[PDB]
């Protein structure tokens, strides 16, 4: 998973693009799991956690980091 330390250099738009990419990846993983071709089921939790990480970074950046 992407680390907060290496996340904290993207300014705002790179963070937003990363969040969009992560949401798309999570969507794809959900579909693959639904149709039964996903083997490593830990990927869903990993992607959910990195989405939460990006959201946390954005929010704390807004609220006087």
């Amino acid at each position: 998973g992407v680390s907060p330390g290496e996340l904290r250099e993207l300014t705002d738009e790179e963070l937003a693009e990363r969040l969009r990419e992560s949401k798309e990846e999570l969507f794809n993983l959900r579909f693959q799991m639904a149709t039964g071709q996903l083997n490593n089921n830990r990927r869903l939790r990993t992607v959910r956690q990195e989405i939460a990480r990006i959201y946390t970074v954005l929010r704390e950046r807004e609220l006087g980091l």
Partner: protein
């Protein structure tokens, strides 16, 4: 904060009825139960870059099961049935050939 259409569409429905509809080019999804038809249509068009003819929705109550002494209820779901425009590019479900 920023809303993504992929938050509305959860997963595709895989069953004999869904496979039958796939030949007719009609796709069944599980959607977030609070969504409405127009929002679903907009979201599908955005996600798959496709043209949508109409959206059909249905709410299904969860089944009740008993485990050792009492009853527990599964979650209720909402299904959206989406029919593409007459001549649109098919949606590639990525593992649902029917």
């Amino acid at each position: 904060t920023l809303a993504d259409p992929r938050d509305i569409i959860l997963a595709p429905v895989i069953s004999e009825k869904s496979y039958g509809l796939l030949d007719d080019n009609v796709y069944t999804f599980l959607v977030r139960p609070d969504s409405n038809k127009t929002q679903i249509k907009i979201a599908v068009e955005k996600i798959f870059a496709v043209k949508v003819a109409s959206v059909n929705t249905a709410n299904r109550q969860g089944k009740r099961k008993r485990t050792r002494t009492g009853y527990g209820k599964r979650k209720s779901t909402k299904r959206a049935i989406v029919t593409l425009a007459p001549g649109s590019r098919p949606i590639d479900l990525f593992g649902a050939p029917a």
